[PDB]
Each structure stands twice: as structure tokens, then as C-alpha cells.
Write an enzyme that holds these catalytic residues in place. Structure first.
Site, PDB file in Angstrom:
ATOM      1  N   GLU A 212       0.644  -1.171   0.094  1.00  0.00           N
ATOM      2  CA  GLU A 212       0.091   0.118  -0.130  1.00  0.00           C
ATOM      3  C   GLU A 212       0.800   1.247   0.059  1.00  0.00           C
ATOM      4  O   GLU A 212       1.688   1.300   0.886  1.00  0.00           O
ATOM      5  CB  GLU A 212      -0.735  -0.241   1.253  1.00  0.00           C
ATOM      6  CG  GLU A 212      -1.807   1.143   1.337  1.00  0.00           C
ATOM      7  CD  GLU A 212      -2.802   1.175   2.503  1.00  0.00           C
ATOM      8  OE1 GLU A 212      -2.656   0.211   3.321  1.00  0.00           O
ATOM      9  OE2 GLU A 212      -3.400   2.320   2.772  1.00  0.00           O
ATOM     10  N   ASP A 214       0.326   5.106   0.717  1.00  0.00           N
ATOM     11  CA  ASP A 214      -0.661   6.248   1.158  1.00  0.00           C
ATOM     12  C   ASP A 214      -0.091   7.253   0.554  1.00  0.00           C
ATOM     13  O   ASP A 214       0.438   7.983   1.480  1.00  0.00           O
ATOM     14  CB  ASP A 214      -1.072   5.969   2.482  1.00  0.00           C
ATOM     15  CG  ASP A 214      -1.756   4.947   2.898  1.00  0.00           C
ATOM     16  OD1 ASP A 214      -2.637   4.525   2.184  1.00  0.00           O
ATOM     17  OD2 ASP A 214      -1.229   4.018   3.707  1.00  0.00           O
ATOM     18  N   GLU A 217      -3.196  11.324   2.979  1.00  0.00           N
ATOM     19  CA  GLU A 217      -4.266  10.711   4.159  1.00  0.00           C
ATOM     20  C   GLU A 217      -4.122  11.997   4.803  1.00  0.00           C
ATOM     21  O   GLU A 217      -3.127  12.301   5.361  1.00  0.00           O
ATOM     22  CB  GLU A 217      -3.590   9.596   4.943  1.00  0.00           C
ATOM     23  CG  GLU A 217      -3.942   8.005   4.199  1.00  0.00           C
ATOM     24  CD  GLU A 217      -3.615   6.982   5.230  1.00  0.00           C
ATOM     25  OE1 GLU A 217      -2.292   6.951   5.512  1.00  0.00           O
ATOM     26  OE2 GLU A 217      -4.521   6.347   5.704  1.00  0.00           O
ATOM     27  N   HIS A 228       3.843   1.348   2.614  1.00  0.00           N
ATOM     28  CA  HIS A 228       3.592   0.131   3.682  1.00  0.00           C
ATOM     29  C   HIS A 228       4.055  -1.099   2.657  1.00  0.00           C
ATOM     30  O   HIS A 228       3.379  -1.756   1.880  1.00  0.00           O
ATOM     31  CB  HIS A 228       2.199  -0.091   3.624  1.00  0.00           C
ATOM     32  CG  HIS A 228       1.606   1.273   4.724  1.00  0.00           C
ATOM     33  ND1 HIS A 228       1.357   0.895   6.021  1.00  0.00           N
ATOM     34  CD2 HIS A 228       1.132   2.443   4.526  1.00  0.00           C
ATOM     35  CE1 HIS A 228       0.826   2.019   6.713  1.00  0.00           C
ATOM     36  NE2 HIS A 228       0.764   2.800   5.726  1.00  0.00           N
TER      37      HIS A 228
END
Ligand code: NAG
Ligand code: CO
Ligand code: CO
Length: 434
Positions: A212, A214, A217, A228
Site C-alpha cells: 500500500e 498512501d 491521508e 507500506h
């Protein structure tokens, strides 16, 4: 799960720019589809719900296989039911939408066709987008990120899933989510436990893991950039607590890194860079441009643009690290100063580079946090810590902020708007759009 048509499925169109090193950009036409979990799941030959509230039909869904055979996902009324709308290159997601029932947020994926997701190879390229987070108070998260999902939503690997990407199947992320109702062409009713604080959700015996990225956010108070890694790059099912992540009996020990190497300017010390009003470098009451570059070394660079003024990610000093580039040295220094070993245990940026070297699906969502009230993003966390604890303060929000029921009641009209997405070689997205 199969697909039913009691409600038609028309994906809101959404255009974006594909830029080239040559200096030009060309418009691409895609659309967005809402994740399967937000849909109505009912019997294939009737209107009887297979899932309602936060429990499954014991007769239609006695086990995962039987459940998937008897159940189907239906169409979504994007605007009236989910508060999702698009206009040209812009996408808006409302927080709380009241129709016959109450809906909270949404998770959407960019499509290439009405039956396939658009895959992006991030390594060597940059992703640019504009965002308006002015209507996002404490406790909310307007997110734009990438996950290593299959372009078909998992259909080729799991034939019992005939709904596919057209109905938003196949989701996965670094939390190895167990709240998904269907994973790998099977339901997730086995071992299902209703949420103690959410009348619409639960946790099942299976989870869905994958890398992942990101990119974004945030809300009007704080913003974070977080890669991640996972030991298995792509989508892969996991069993029970062995899944790790927020849901499980132990967030670690799984195949993915649920924490990641996060870069939150506020958390790193610059509390004047991002916030509401003219007292901040970037005024969150106004739209801003966010550009993220994935250099081939595996490091991530970031710069912002607002009112024609450009700002590189603010410099941060942590341990022996000094700079604004999210690289190995930063991530290692963060673990040393803020604590933790999850990111490094999972392989760090070297392992993450395997994800960005492959294809990833673009996800855009709006959610509130039923586990930690989003305190990890915009407040002091854990709440018993103080500023004397390295990295404890991530935002100015009260440690009492973000209770889902409260923000849903107080800020139902909150929303996030993502627009002007541009993708191409590093250094190319700032040129004129096609
Ligand atoms: C925060 O970052 C901005 C942009 O790099 C910079 O101009 C400003 O001086 C920084 N402020 C602090 C307190 O570090
Ligand atoms: Co199993
Ligand atoms: Co970075």
C-alpha cells in the site's frame, strides 16, 4: 460472489492526464467504482439480504462457499445513496448521505474500462492531483492512495467471483483488512464477529493483504505520506489473527507492515506548514496541488503548489537524518526515534520498490475511524503521551476528537474533492494538460 442487476451500475466518469517526457499530456477517460462492501448483498434469485446490519443470513450463508454461491452484489446509486459525484476531472465524496438509509463515506477505484481497474506503474513516475480538504474536520480522512490489486478484481484467480472489478471486488491493503465481506471468491461469514461500535460492520476469519502506497491521508488539520511494504507484494488472503493489522489480536506478526514509514510534517516538527488559514504555509481552506515522485532508487520525493507558489516537502531532522526526501535513512531514523520495527521487518523501501515496480490501483476514499478516532493522524497518540514523547503529537486536534457517532452527527456535510489527476514521468506533470 456473482452480480445482480436489480439496481443498474453506471460508473461515474472521470478523466485524468497521462503526461510524457516530451512535454505534452494527453487526456485519458476512465471512471470510478465503489468497493463491494458498500453494496447491497442479496440472494441471486430474490431480494432477500445475505448481509444486513452487521450480521449474515445464517440460512443463505452457512459457510463461505455456500454464501458466495447463493449471494450477489448489486448496483450502486452513486449520488443519491453514496454521495459520490464527478465532473470532468473532478471527484467529490460526501461524508454522510441520507437516503432510505444512512451511508458513511465510500472507497472508490479508478477504472480503465467498465470491467477492469486502471493499473499504474509508479516507479520512475510521478502522480499529481489537486485536493480541497477545507470541509474535512478533525477525525476525518480524505484519502488517495495505491494498492497492489489485480486489474480484474480477482476473477481470473477465483472463478466463484464473477462480479469482478465492475462491482469493486478484490480490495486489499497493508492492514490485511478482515472487514471485507467477500475475499477470494468466498464470503467471509465464517468467524464473523460484529463490530462493537459500528452497526454496519464486522470482522471475519479472513483478511486481504497487499502493498500500500498512501500518497495522501489527510483532513484540514494534518496530512501524511506513507509507504507500506508486505512480504508478498500482491493481493493475498490471510487467516485470523495471523493477519495482523488493526483488526487482529496482534497488529504485527502478519505479512504486511500496518504502520509504514510515515511522513507527517506536523509530526516531524513543522506545525506551521499545513493548516486552516493564512497562518500556515499551505492554507487548507483553499485547494492545493500535491505532487509525489517515485525515483528509481526507491526513495519518494514530494512538493506542493498553491496559488502558483511551490514548496518542497519541508525539511525534517530526526536522529542523524536531515532532509525532505523519504528514503532509507529517514525510515531507519524514524524507527530509531519514534520506535517500532514493522517497516524494516517487512523489507523497507527495497521491498516496497517491488510494489511500485509493478502495477497498483488508484483508490480514493473518505472515512472516519472506528478504531482510533483518527488520532494517529491529527492528534496526540497514544492519548496518554505528551509532546515530550518523540512523534506523539501529529496534529492540533483534541485527543477527544473523532468519535465516529459524534463527527457523523456534527459534520454530516463534510466532504473531500480530488481533481486534476496527472500521471507521467518524473518532471512531466507540471506541463500543459491535453
Ligand atoms: C515549515 O516549512 C516551510 C516550508 O518548507 C518553511 O518555509 C518554514 O520555515 C517551516 N517552519 C518551521 C517552523 O519549521
Ligand atoms: Co480459510
Ligand atoms: Co516522500
Amino acid at each position: 460472489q456473482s452480480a445482480c442487476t436489480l439496481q443498474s451500475e453506471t460508473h461515474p466518469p472521470l478523466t485524468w492526464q497521462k503526461c510524457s517526457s516530451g512535454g505534452t499530456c494527453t487526456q485519458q477517460t476512465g471512471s470510478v467504482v465503489i468497493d463491494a462492501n458498500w453494496r447491497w448483498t442479496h440472494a441471486t434469485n430474490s431480494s432477500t439480504n445475505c448481509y444486513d446490519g452487521n450480521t449474515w443470513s445464517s440460512t443463505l450463508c452457512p459457510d463461505n462457499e455456500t454464501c458466495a454461491k447463493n449471494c450477489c452484489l448489486d448496483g450502486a446509486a452513486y449520488a443519491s445513496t453514496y454521495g459520490v459525484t464527478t465532473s470532468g476531472n473532478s471527484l467529490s465524496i460526501d461524508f454522510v448521505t441520507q437516503s432510505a438509509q444512512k451511508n458513511v463515506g465510500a472507497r472508490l477505484y479508478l477504472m480503465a474500462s467498465d470491467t477492469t481497474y486502471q493499473e499504474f506503474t509508479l516507479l520512475g513516475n510521478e502522480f499529481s492531483f489537486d485536493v480541497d480538504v477545507s470541509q474535512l474536520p478533525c477525525g476525518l480522512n480524505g484519502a488517495l492512495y495505491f494498492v497492489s490489486m489485480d486489474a480484474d478484481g480477482g476473477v481470473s484467480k477465483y472463478p466463484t467471483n464473477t462480479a469482478g472489478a465492475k462491482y469493486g471486488t478484490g480490495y486489499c491493503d497493508s492492514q490485511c483488512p478482515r472487514d471485507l465481506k467477500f475475499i477470494n471468491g468466498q464470503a467471509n461469514v465464517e468467524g464473523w464477529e460484529p463490530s462493537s461500535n459500528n452497526a454496519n460492520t464486522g470482522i471475519g476469519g479472513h483478511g486481504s493483504c497487499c502493498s500500500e502506497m498512501d500518497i495522501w491521508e489527510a483532513n484540514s488539520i494534518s496530512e501524511a505520506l506513507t509507504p507500506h511494504p508486505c512480504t508478498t507484494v500482491g493481493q493475498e488472503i490471510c487467516e485470523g489473527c495471523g493477519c495482523g493489522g488493526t483488526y487482529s489480536c496482534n497488529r504485527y506478526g502478519g505479512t504486511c507492515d500496518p504502520d509504514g514509514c510515515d511522513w507527517n510534517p506536523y509530526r516531524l516538527g513543522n506545525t506551521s506548514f499545513y493548516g486552516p488559514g493564512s497562518s500556515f504555509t499551505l492554507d487548507t481552506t483553499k485547494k492545493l496541488t500535491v505532487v509525489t515522485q517515485f525515483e528509481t532508487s526507491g526513495a519518494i520525493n514530494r512538493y506542493y503548489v498553491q496559488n502558483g507558489v511551490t514548496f518542497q516537502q519541508p525539511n525534517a531532522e530526526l536522529g542523524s537524518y536531515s532532509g525532505n526526501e523519504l528514503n532509507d535513512d529517514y525510515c531507519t531514523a524514524e524507527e530509531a526515534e519514534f520506535g517500532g520495527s514493522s517497516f524494516s521487518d517487512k523489507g523497507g523501501l527495497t521491498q516496497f520498490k517491488k510494489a511500485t515496480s509493478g502495477g497498483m490501483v488508484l483508490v480514493m476514499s473518505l472515512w472516519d475511524d472506528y478504531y482510533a478516532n483518527m488520532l494517529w493522524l491529527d492528534s496526540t497518540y497514544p492519548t496518554n503521551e505528551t509532546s515530550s514523547t518523540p512523534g506523539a503529537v501529529r496534529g492540533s486536534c483534541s485527543t477527544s476528537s473523532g468519535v465516529p457517532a459524534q463527527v457523523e452527527s456534527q459534520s454530516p456535510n463534510a466532504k473531500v474533492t480530488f481533481s486534476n489527476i496527472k500521471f507521467g514521468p518524473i518532471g512531466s506533470t507540471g506541463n500543459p494538460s491535453g
